[PDB]
Design a protein around this ligand. Sequence first.
Ligand code: HEM
Ligand code: CL
Length: 439
Amino acid sequence: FNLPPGKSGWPFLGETIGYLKPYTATTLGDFMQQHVSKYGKIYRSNLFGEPTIVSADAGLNRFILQNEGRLFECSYPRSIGGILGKWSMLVLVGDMHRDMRSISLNFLSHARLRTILLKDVERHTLFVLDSWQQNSIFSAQDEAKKFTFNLMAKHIMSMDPGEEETEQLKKEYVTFMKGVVSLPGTAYHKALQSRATILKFIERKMEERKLDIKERKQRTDDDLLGWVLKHSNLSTEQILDLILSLLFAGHETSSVAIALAIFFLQACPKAVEELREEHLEIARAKKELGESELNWDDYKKMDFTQCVINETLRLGNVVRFLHRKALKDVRYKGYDIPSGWKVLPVISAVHLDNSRYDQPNLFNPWRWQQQNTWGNNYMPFGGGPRLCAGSELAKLEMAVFIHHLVLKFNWELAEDDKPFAFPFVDFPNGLLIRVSRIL
Ligand code: HEM
Ligand SMILES: [Cl-]
């Protein structure tokens, strides 16, 4: 019987404060690097109020991910467990989760991806990028968040950008997100108030949709709200939790990824040159054909863009680790994971590994003309039965945004900045950039 080595830290809190200490997002951070150096890639700790096995071992992390529902299961801390609702897909397990995942996969199907969703992705890209003024200075992080929130609101509830009900859902949504990152104080009871308001807003739009469906109007299931009403048997409270958890799942991730790409690309002008060549050829082809909107076949031509995307996610690491629990005693590589203990697969660790990538701290999208996303080396979307249901939409959002960005603008940092993990990734100075339109 061999328990992994490590400390236990302070009572109640353990090593949580040190574990959560902000660190530059392109690294693992002092706490993680030092613990791996002293104890190895598998070590024990006391985190988020529970005894914990931390894993920076890519072989163990894929074993955990693939054995969801058998040896391990998703398990958030008590505080974080319930802010997205009892029926949040990110927290559910068992049959209910299997049913909610099947719904998300079907709504995000390839057929719907290449017709419905792509049109909205390009429309929302141009809604943002056409408002950018010459020689202006602004926060790219805020613009990225604008793009992805607008886009998600369209996808889930057919809301249009810039309209009042959408700008007000943003303020309510961010006030609610100030609860996840937290006495409770007046900034936690405020987040529960906002959550209730949001749930009442979603239930309002749900009743309007049930009327559209009863009156047999066409294309009622273009958004997620209409889709679950027509194609599922979820209850009202289940629908509200699904809508809210999808907004979070799709916006918090995609916004960071877009911002990371803007950041990495201004420091890699040769990658922007190759992107312009690839995207100018696509645009020239459509001009000769007299076609205006992008189609799936144009997206399939964005080979080097997919290299930038993979490199952005490998180096930037939108998600630092996952929250899991062991369902029974497990033995792996000679260590014992006791039942009921928390298990944290640090899926970001292998992305920064010297032995799996050559110069992992360098942004080098050309490495993906040799490497591949299959296997242990690459898991920014997770793995196993909970592998990210929106990954294909995420890549499409980045590709379409990049396409119009490099065709319309040059950009530079107006103020020094760097990404940090809190563990959520964010730019402290807001990623201010100056832009100028091309010829
Ligand atoms: C760069 C963008 C994204 C990244 C890095 C990312 C990452 C992840 C990861 C690591 C998980 C696994 C959670 C776990 O195993 O506990 C996950 C789950 C999920 N993601 Fe994403 N995601 C991204 C974009 C999106 C988008 C755009 C959507 C939807 C519009 C989405 C929807 C979901 C859903 C529904 C799940 C739950 C899957 C399940 O429980 O079976 N994601 N994501
Ligand atoms: Cl490499």
